[PDB]
């Protein structure tokens, strides 16, 4: 049951083209698609759940969190617009906070009681 | 030296295939006619645009009864006259004969199934083999498919092509500069031109198919604005309703095959551009069969 | 019928309204032996039915197929051809060796030519063609010497010696012409050979072997231009070779009157004259100005733009220039 | 090895690609022609008897080639030598291969002489019947029919016994094959022998637990419903008939209903009435749509062949409530099946019975959601209009007809279109003019081309029927209005209208109305319009006056000949040649 | 010579149904653009402009005899501003030519350059003005490369047997080769191939232009290769010192093309002598 | 107004002057007794849902994707 968070850059610098003729955001979407295709080769891949975070404002940064099916992830991934700043730090903090959202409530981090691998 | 061609057209309307020598002469005439056509074939405004047929011959006759009989009605077929049907040979022969007889009154564009590999796999080759006991007719037809124009251009506004756009293509001059007389490659300009689809997407994307790209609304908007095109007619994808506008009325997918393998149950439709580009879609259901 | 059908019935040879049969037999034999011998004999018989029209076989049949056919003919009929010689032999072996060497040099010349690009088993055929062409290039000198020696001899299903000599010397001239791109003496030899070919054709005055008349005329014109040992174009070329430039001007004025020479040729000779003037003799300034003025006047008459060279040559103008 | 042509050549061809093997199969005749006939049989046929591993494609062609040996094998004395290799191929597991095998076997058996046929094929028939492989018995099933009308009595009886033993086989494929081939077998057998041998165990076969075997048993049953004498036919068929009709398996009941008409026609009127009136009503009252649709299709043929004395009574008593309940069925397909021939009963029932019972059913059908239903019901208005009279239909179905004329499906619209000549013939000019004339004009502007050409032909019919000055007062102004349309297809509808009308519109009317209209259309920018004008002038050429013909048509056709478009050139030249 | 009431009438046209579902885009296209001017006036306007340019470029003074020399600095300025105007000078702007793989990878810029050359005939005149001064044409390497790539694409795509069915492309290929020869970017042997372009089939002329591309790959239009001949104050390209200046493989290709069509090209064989 | 879905029939302010008469005729004819075909691309050729919605018929007796399996 792993988690795969794709922190796709949506800064306007991702509109740069390459010799492919597509923008960097297009190649990022294709990279996620091909990562899914390669991952699906393994039998264990049926248990993963994907997450999507972008370089937007906090109320809109997360667009595929928990309780989001695969179809919603794909639909959100297709309709990504590279139009923000390269606010890497704030978005990375949002991603880490999203991942650590459920840790305390389920008490997986045994604070003051040793670390359990 | 044309009464035999009208006799062939009359014969084909009854779904009776021609002999090998007749097909050879027809392919020769068509090659001598198609070579004088640019990759972007200019088409006068009054024309009935029709999507895929895929060898569903009785449905092609249904389409003719809907839109009228050529040469009284101008037509424009955007590829896929073969495969996924039990009467591919009759359909393609009738279309090529109409092209030879009435070259001004009908335009046939290359599809993504107009390829040697696709015909070998998807059963046009098998149909030719059964109906003629050899591969000679299949060879003659697949040689002809290299000469079919990639796209069309109705009145300088409507851009008709089988597939979608390409990341490396952003001008009609680029399409005009292509060397169409070859097999459909596994990549590059014309492969994407024949295999790409639109999508509710931003930017480009790898197609679910094995070739081409998926282009979003912004792509079609930029292409249309750059090339002075109002609409990009397309026919590569199935449509249950028969036709379907896309990308804020920048792209319309037209499917002219009622059913697709005689099992999908989809409706069909054909666009009818009049003398002033006042469009109109005429949907129809599959014709009754025995 | 087909390859197996014709094996047992011996009546389709004179009835069918041939190259298809030859390639079918060759392909059937190519599959990895009484049947092989029978197929080869049938192939040779049908090949002889066309009277060994080597152009038809060369263009229709492939290179390895015809190579195998000629090798099989050599094996059945006879057996370092240069050491062999012995023209006083049966006519069958003589014509077989002559045809093989003719095919060798013609294939060399044809492989030298360019072919339209291969836009799309074919790989194996291409590899076989490459290997055969390489080995043919290896022993080209032996083959051409054998053909020349055979052509020299005049001591002849035998055919007229005149037609055989005309065809073999035409092929010799073509081989030298291809060879002569990097040697002018070979071009002189080719010119002599083509003049001999033309003399033989004139002498016999035949109309039944097959020689491309247009190609022969082109070869004769090319040899005359390269090694003359008439028309204003050739006159300008000869004068440029020698240096009688005033005659070039007078021909150019006549050309302005008649509008005969290509515009491209005149611009090219103007360019090379300008190159020589900018490199060497100072007296070439006036000759360059004069030919440039001729070219400018022709361009004006034809309705084309005035050259930049004329414009710079009419800075600081003089009485004589105007 | 290589010296000998046949074996080595065919083996190497087999080693080649499969299409080359197919080419070799057609080549089999040539090797037979080249080699001696005795060489051909004695050498090749043992090789053809075994070592076959090409089940996919070449076997059907091989069987066909073996069936073509008219004289290549030499004659019947060698056709029986040709028999064993077909037997070897008859055991092929692929079904179509066996089908072509038994086809070739039947052909050569016909080619055989009588004594040769018995003495050679009968051991083969026993061997295939007695073979360990069920495939051999399924192949053997076909051959039992061909030997019978030429072989002697004792071998006839032995053949019948062997077929009867074959039907007892445990594997259901063998019984299926026997049942399928039972029809022709019983057809050629003698009636007393048919009864005594087949009918007990044929009824046993009909009672078999395998549903497919029961379907094919029903096929055999309807096949053999005409050879027995009447009383024995009753005693031997009716228990089996009702058993099959009320069978549990829905497929069996569907097959019983599908083949009902010929079963009915073959076993007499009164017997069918008495012992099938409950079963037939049961078939239409079943719980599955397939058998109900089949029965609904067969209703009209079932009714029309009954004895006329009590036909109306049995119809009105049994069938009519069932049809009434059937019209309201949820499944649309059964309604479409019923709608095809529901109104065929109207001549049989009578005027008053149709008006009372059948008219509300017709009105319900016309207002049904399923377009297939609407297509089927409209397709036979001729008979009901003929037997009911124009007055009752006009009072009753005319608004429904008009509502149907506005339907989405163009096929429905053209179905409505075809009856305008029929309605016109039986109705006055004034009422049609004030009710349907504008409706007729409405079809001319329809999107679908089929509708427009149908309306054009109907306009021809109306003008030849309702006179000429009436068309000038009603039809011609709308056509002229259509001539000014911007869309070109409406102008082409106008030109087709000119074509059809001008033949029966009278010379003076045709010229003085159409010719100013047709001539102005010649300057249209669309090339389609120009070449259609040329074609129209060619067609309506001989029918108009000659001075006007020359003076008007000739200059504009001369103009069109030099027009740039190729089609306009060709059609103008053709028109000039036609006019001469 | 360069290139380049509604509602009321609608009610008049309008039986009581729309029939057509709508108008595709903004209705009918316009009556298209037209142009017309006397070609004599175009020629002499171009002559006036080119005479002014030659006056501005030629160095002052002096002596009583000798035609003036076009200044390579002024012609370099004209070259670089031409490059800026026509194309964006965006990528692959180094003077060294790349492989033909790059020619297939930048077809859009090449087509833009080709269309600019086709619409504006004045560009070729300015090109040969630049080519009059030897070193300056090297700085138009991007322009020449793009135009040559466009012509190669056209000749590959062409299907006619004769090369005269494409009039502008034939003329452009001839002019392009002649201009490259004028600027000493090609040897005299390669420089004469435009004389024979009018006779060949499309694939042969494509092969010759590809040979030109290969030669420019091998040697290149590098201004450092031009040696300043102080004897007359002019730069001169020495191909004999360059090594393989005659272009061995390229002359082999040209000889093969000539030999194939020797019937029509016999007289032109002397133009390609050493 | 992105994703506005202008109710042209319902509101008269959404009719451009460019095509006022044609839409007037269409809404008039629609109003008497006598947005679609803009489905998303994903739901454009999903034949499974369309067939499931439609009534069932009579019971039954190189590149990778090219649609309809
Ligand atoms: Mn397609
Ligand atoms: Mn398709």
Curated annotation (Swiss-Prot), chain C:
TPR repeats lie at residues 166-204, 230-263. It is linked to Neurodevelopmental disorder with cerebellar hypoplasia and spasticity: An autosomal recessive neurodevelopmental disorder characterized by global developmental delay, profound intellectual disability, seizures, absent speech, spasticity, facial and limb dysmorphism, and subtle structural brain abnormalities including cerebellar hypoplasia. The WFEF motif is required for the recruitment of protein phosphatase 2A (PP2A) to transcription pause-release checkpoint. Its main location: nucleus. The gene is INTS8. Component of the integrator complex, a multiprotein complex that terminates RNA polymerase II (Pol II) transcription in the promoter-proximal region of genes. It comes from the Eukaryota. Component of the Integrator complex, composed of core subunits INTS1, INTS2, INTS3, INTS4, INTS5, INTS6, INTS7, INTS8, INTS9/RC74, INTS10, INTS11/CPSF3L, INTS12, INTS13, INTS14 and INTS15. The core complex associates with protein phosphatase 2A subunits PPP2CA and PPP2R1A, to form the Integrator-PP2A (INTAC) complex. A motif (WFEF motif) lies at residues 3-8. Signal peptide: none annotated. This is Integrator complex subunit 8. One of its GO terms (cellular component) is chromatin. It comes from Homo sapiens. Belongs to the Integrator subunit 8 family. The keyword Phosphoprotein applies. Transmembrane segments: none annotated. Keywords: Chromosome, Disease variant, Intellectual disability, Nucleus, Phosphoprotein, Repeat, TPR repeat. It is found in: Nucleus; Chromosome.
Swiss-Prot record, chain D:
Residues 78-232 are annotated as: SV40 small T antigen binding. The gene is PPP2R1A. PP2A consists of a common heterodimeric core enzyme, composed of PPP2CA a 36 kDa catalytic subunit (subunit C) and PPP2R1A a 65 kDa constant regulatory subunit (PR65 or subunit A), that associates with a variety of regulatory subunits. Proteins that associate with the core dimer include three families of regulatory subunits B (the R2/B/PR55/B55, R3/B''/PR72/PR130/PR59 and R5/B'/B56 families), the 48 kDa variable regulatory subunit, viral proteins, and cell signaling molecules. Found in a complex with at least ARL2, PPP2CB, PPP2R1A, PPP2R2A, PPP2R5E and TBCD. (Microbial infection) Interacts with JC virus small t antigen; this interaction inhibits PPP2R1A activity. Residues 1-392 are annotated as: PP2A subunit B binding. Each HEAT repeat appears to consist of two alpha helices joined by a hydrophilic region, the intrarepeat loop. The repeat units may be arranged laterally to form a rod-like structure. HEAT repeats lie at residues 1-39, 40-77, 78-116, 117-154, 155-193, 194-232, 233-271, 272-314, 315-353, 354-392, 393-431, 432-470, 471-509, 510-548, 549-580. One of its GO terms (cellular component) is cytoplasm. It is found in: Cytoplasm; Nucleus; Chromosome; Chromosome, Centromere. This is Serine/threonine-protein phosphatase 2A 65 kDa regulatory subunit A alpha isoform. Changing residue 463 to A: In HJS2; uncertain significance; does not affect interaction with PPP2R5D and PPP2CA.
UniProtKB/Swiss-Prot annotation, chain E:
The chain crosses the membrane at residues 122-142, 196-216. It is found in: Nucleus; Cytoplasm; Nucleus membrane. Belongs to the Integrator subunit 5 family. Component of the Integrator complex, composed of core subunits INTS1, INTS2, INTS3, INTS4, INTS5, INTS6, INTS7, INTS8, INTS9/RC74, INTS10, INTS11/CPSF3L, INTS12, INTS13, INTS14 and INTS15. The core complex associates with protein phosphatase 2A subunits PPP2CA and PPP2R1A, to form the Integrator-PP2A (INTAC) complex. Component of the integrator complex, a multiprotein complex that terminates RNA polymerase II (Pol II) transcription in the promoter-proximal region of genes. This is Integrator complex subunit 5. It comes from Homo sapiens. The lineage of its organism: Eukaryota, Metazoa, Chordata, Craniata, Vertebrata. The chain holds residues 706 to 1008 of 1019 of the full protein.
Swiss-Prot record, chain F:
Widely expressed. Expressed in heart, brain, placenta, lung, liver, skeletal muscle, kidney and pancreas. Disulfide bonds: none annotated. Transmembrane segments: none annotated. It is found in: Nucleus; Chromosome. Component of the integrator complex, a multiprotein complex that terminates RNA polymerase II (Pol II) transcription in the promoter-proximal region of genes. Component of the Integrator complex, composed of core subunits INTS1, INTS2, INTS3, INTS4, INTS5, INTS6, INTS7, INTS8, INTS9/RC74, INTS10, INTS11/CPSF3L, INTS12, INTS13, INTS14 and INTS15. The core complex associates with protein phosphatase 2A subunits PPP2CA and PPP2R1A, to form the Integrator-PP2A (INTAC) complex. This is Integrator complex subunit 6. The lineage of its organism: Eukaryota, Metazoa, Chordata, Craniata, Vertebrata.
């Amino acid at each position: 049951m792993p988690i795969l968070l794709f922190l796709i850059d949506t800064s306007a610098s991702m509109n740069q083209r390459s010799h492919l003729g597509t923008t960097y955001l297009d190649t990022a979407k294709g990279a996620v698609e091909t990562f899914m295709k390669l991952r699906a080769r393994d039998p264990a891949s049926r248990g993963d759940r994907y997450m999507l975070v972008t370089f937007e404002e906090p109320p809109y940064a997360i667009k595929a969190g928990w309780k989001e099916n695969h179809a919603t992830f794909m639909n959100e991934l297709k309709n990504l617009q590279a139009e923000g700043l390269t606010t890497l730090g704030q978005s990375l903090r949002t991603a880490f906070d999203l991942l650590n959202l459920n840790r305390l409530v389920t008490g997986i981090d045994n604070y003051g009681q040793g670390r359990n691998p | 030296f044309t009464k035999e061609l009208d006799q062939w057209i009359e014969q084909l309307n009854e779904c009776k295939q021609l002999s090998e020598s007749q097909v050879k002469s027809l392919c020769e005439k068509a090659k001598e006619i198609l070579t004088k056509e640019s990759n972007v074939q200019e088409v006068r405004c009054p024309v009935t645009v029709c999507g895929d047929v895929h060898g569903q011959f009785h449905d092609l006759m249904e389409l003719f009864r809907i839109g009228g009989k050529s040469p009284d009605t101008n037509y424009l077929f955007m590829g896929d006259y073969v495969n996924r049907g039990y009467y591919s040979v009759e359909t393609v022969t009738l279309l090529v004969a109409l092209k030879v007889r009435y070259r001004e009154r009908i335009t046939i564009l290359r599809g993504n199934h107009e390829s040697r590999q696709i015909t070998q796999v998807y059963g046009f080759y098998d149909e030719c083999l059964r109906k003629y006991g050899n591969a000679n007719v299949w060879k003659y037809f697949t040689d002809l498919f290299d000469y079919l124009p990639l796209t069309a251009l109705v009145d300088g506004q409507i851009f008709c092509l089988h597939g979608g756009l390409s990341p490396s293509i952003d001008t009609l001059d680029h399409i005009r500069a292509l060397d169409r007389l070859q097999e459909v490659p596994h990549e590059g300009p014309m492969c994407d031109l024949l295999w790409s689809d639109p999508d509710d997407r931003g930017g480009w994307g790898i197609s679910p198919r094995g070739a081409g790209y998926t282009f979003g609304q912004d792509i079609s908007e930029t292409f249309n604005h750059a090339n002075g095109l109002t609409l990009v007619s397309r026919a590569h994808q199935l449509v249950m309703e028969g036709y379907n506008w896309c990308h804020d009325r920048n792209v319309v997918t037209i499917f002219s095959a009622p059913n697709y393998c005689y099992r999908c149950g989809n409706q069909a439709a054909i666009m009818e551009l009049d003398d002033t580009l006042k469009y109109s879609f005429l949907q129809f259901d599959p014709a009754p069969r025995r | 019928t087909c390859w197996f059908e014709f094996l047992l019935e011996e009546s389709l040879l004179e009835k069918h309204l041939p190259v298809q049969l030859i390639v079918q037999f060759l392909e059937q034999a190519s599959k990895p032996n009484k049947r092989n011998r029978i197929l080869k004999l049938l192939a040779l018989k049908v090949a002889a039915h066309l009277k060994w029209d080597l152009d038809i076989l060369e263009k229709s049949l492939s290179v390895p197929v015809l190579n195998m056919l000629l090798n099989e003919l050599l094996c059945i009929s006879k057996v370092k051809h240069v050491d062999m010689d012995l023209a006083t032999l049966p006519p069958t072996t003589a014509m077989a060796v002559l045809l093989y060497n003719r095919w060798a040099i013609r294939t060399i010349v044809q492989s030298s030519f360019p072919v339209k690009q291969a836009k799309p088993q074919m790989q194996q055929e291409k590899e076989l063609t490459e290997n055969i062409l390489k080995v043919l290039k290896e022993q080209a000198a032996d083959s051409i010497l054998v053909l020349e020696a055979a052509l020299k001899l005049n001591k002849d299903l035998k055919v007229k010696t005149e037609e055989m000599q005309c065809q073999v010397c035409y092929d010799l001239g073509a081989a030298y012409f291809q060879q002569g791109s990097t040697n002018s003496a070979v071009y002189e030899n080719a010119r002599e050979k083509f003049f001999r070919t033309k003399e033989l054709i004139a002498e016999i005055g035949s109309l039944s072997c097959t020689i491309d008349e247009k190609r022969l005329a082109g070869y004769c014109q090319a040899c005359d231009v390269l090694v003359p040992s008439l028309t204003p174009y050739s006159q300008v070329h000869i004068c440029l070779r020698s240096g009688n430039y005033q005659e070039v001007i007078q021909i150019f004025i006549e050309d302005n009157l008649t509008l005969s020479l290509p515009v491209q040729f005149r611009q090219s000779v103007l360019r090379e004259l300008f190159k020589k003037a900018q490199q060497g003799n100072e007296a070439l300034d006036e000759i360059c100005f004069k030919v440039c003025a001729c070219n400018t006047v022709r361009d004006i008459l034809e309705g084309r733009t005035i050259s930049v060279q004329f414009n710079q040559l009419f800075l600081r103008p003089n009485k004589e220039k105007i | 090895d290589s010296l000998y042509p046949i074996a080595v050549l065919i083996d190497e061809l087999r080693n080649e690609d499969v299409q080359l093997r197919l080419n070799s199969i057609k080549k089999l005749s040539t090797i037979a022609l080249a080699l001696g006939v005795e060489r051909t049989r004695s050498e090749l046929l043992p090789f053809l008897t075994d070592t076959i591993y090409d089940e996919d494609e070449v076997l059907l062609a091989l069987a066909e080639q073996l069936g073509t040996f008219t004289t290549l094998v030499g004659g019947p004395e060698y056709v029986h030598c040709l028999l064993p290799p077909l037997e070897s191929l008859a055991t092929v597991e692929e079904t179509v291969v066996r089908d072509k095998a038994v086809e070739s076997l039947r052909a050569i058996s016909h080619e055989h002489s009588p004594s040769d046929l018995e003495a050679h094929f009968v051991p083969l028939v026993k061997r295939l019947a007695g073979g360990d492989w069920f495939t051999s018995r399924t192949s053997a099933c076909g051959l039992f029919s061909v030997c019978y009308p030429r072989v002697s009595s004792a071998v006839k009886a032995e053949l019948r016994q062997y077929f009867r033993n074959l039907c007892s086989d445990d594997t259901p494929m063998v019984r299926r094959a026997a049942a399928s081939k039972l029809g022709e077998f019983a057809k050629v057998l003698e009636l007393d022998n048919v009864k005594s041998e087949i009918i007990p165990m044929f009824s046993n076969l009909a009672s078999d637990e395998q549903d497919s075997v029961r379907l094919l048993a029903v096929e055999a049953c309807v096949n053999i419903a005409q050879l027995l004498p009447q009383e024995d036919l009753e005693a031997l068929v009716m228990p089996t008939l009702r058993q099959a009709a009320e069978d549990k398996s829905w497929r069996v009941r569907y097959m019983v209903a599908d083949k009902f008409t010929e079963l009915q026609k073959a076993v007499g009127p009164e017997i069918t009435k008495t012992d099938l009136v409950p079963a037939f009503q049961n078939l239409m009252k079943d719980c599955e749509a397939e058998v109900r649709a089949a029965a609904s299709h067969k209703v009209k043929e079932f009714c029309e062949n009954l004895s006329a004395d009590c036909r109306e009574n049995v119809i009105m008593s049994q069938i009519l409530p069932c049809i009434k309940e059937l019209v309201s069925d949820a499944n649309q397909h059964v309604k479409s099946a019923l709608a095809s021939v529901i109104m065929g009963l109207s001549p049989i029932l009578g005027k008053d019975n149709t008006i009372e019972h059948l008219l509300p059913l017709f009105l319900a059908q016309l207002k049904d959601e399923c377009p297939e239903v609407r297509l089927n019901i409209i397709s036979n208005l001729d008979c009901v209009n003929e037997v009911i009279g124009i007055r009752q239909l006009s009072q009753s179905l005319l608004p429904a007809i008009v509502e149907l004329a506005e339907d989405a499906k163009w096929r429905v619209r053209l179905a409505i279109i075809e009856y305008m000549p029929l309605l016109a013939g039986q109705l006055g000019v004034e009422f049609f003019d004030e009710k349907l004339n504008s409706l007729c004009m409405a079809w001319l502007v329809d999107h679908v081309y089929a509708i427009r050409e149908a309306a054009t032909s109907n306009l021809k019919k109306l003008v030849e029927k309702f006179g000429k000055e009436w068309a000038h007062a009603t039809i011609i102004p709308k056509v002229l209005a259509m001539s000014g349309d911007p869309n070109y297809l409406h102008r082409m509808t106008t030109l087709f209208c000119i074509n059809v009308l001008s033949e029966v519109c009278g010379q003076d009317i045709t010229t003085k109305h159409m010719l100013p209209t047709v001539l102005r259309m010649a300057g249209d920018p669309v090339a389609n319009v120009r070449f259609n004008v040329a074609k129209s002038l060619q067609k309506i050429g001989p029918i108009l006056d000659n001075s006007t013909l020359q003076s008007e048509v000739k200059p504009i056709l001369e103009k069109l000949t030099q027009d740039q478009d190729v089609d306009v050139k060709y059609f103008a030249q053709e028109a000039l040649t036609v006019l001469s | 010579g360069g290139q380049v009431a509604s509602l009321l009438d609608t009610n008049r046209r309008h039986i009581w149904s729309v029939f057509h579902a709508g108008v595709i885009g903004r209705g009918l296209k316009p009556p298209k653009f037209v142009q017309s001017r006397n070609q004599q006036e175009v020629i002499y306007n171009t002559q006036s402009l080119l005479s002014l340019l030659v006056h501005c470029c030629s160095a002052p003074g002096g002596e009583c005899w000798g035609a003036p020399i076009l200044s390579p600095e002024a012609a370099k300025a004209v070259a670089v501003t031409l490059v800026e105007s026509v194309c964006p000078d965006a990528a692959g702007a180094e003077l060294a030519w790349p492989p033909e793989e790059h020619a297939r990878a930048t077809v859009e810029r090449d087509l833009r350059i080709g269309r600019r050359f086709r619409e504006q005939p004045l560009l070729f005149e300015l090109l040969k003005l630049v080519a009059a001064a030897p070193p300056a044409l090297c700085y138009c390497s991007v322009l020449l490369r793009g135009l040559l790539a466009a012509l190669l694409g056209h000749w590959e795509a062409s299907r006619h047997p004769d090369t005269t069915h494409s009039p502008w492309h034939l003329e452009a290929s001839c002019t392009l080769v002649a201009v490259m020869a004028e600027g000493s970017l090609l040897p005299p042997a390669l420089g004469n191939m435009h004389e024979v372009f009018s006779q060949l089939a499309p694939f042969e002329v494509r092969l010759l232009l590809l040979s030109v591309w290969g030669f420019l790959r091998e040697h290149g239009p590098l201004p450092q290769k031009f040696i300043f001949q102080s004897e007359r104050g002019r730069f001169i390209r020495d191909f004999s010192r360059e090594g393989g200046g005659e272009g061995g493989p390229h002359l082999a290709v040209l000889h093969s093309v000539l030999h194939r069509n020797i019937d029509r090209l016999g007289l032109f064989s002397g133009r390609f002598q050493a | 107004n992105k994703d506005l879905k202008p109710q042209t029939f319902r509101n008269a302010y959404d009719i451009p002057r460019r095509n006022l008469l044609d839409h007037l005729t269409r809404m008039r004819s629609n109003l008497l007794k006598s947005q679609v075909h803009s489905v998303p691309i994903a739901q454009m050729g999903n034949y499974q849902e369309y067939l499931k919605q439609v009534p069932s018929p009579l019971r039954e007796l190189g590149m990778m994707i090219d649609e309809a399996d």
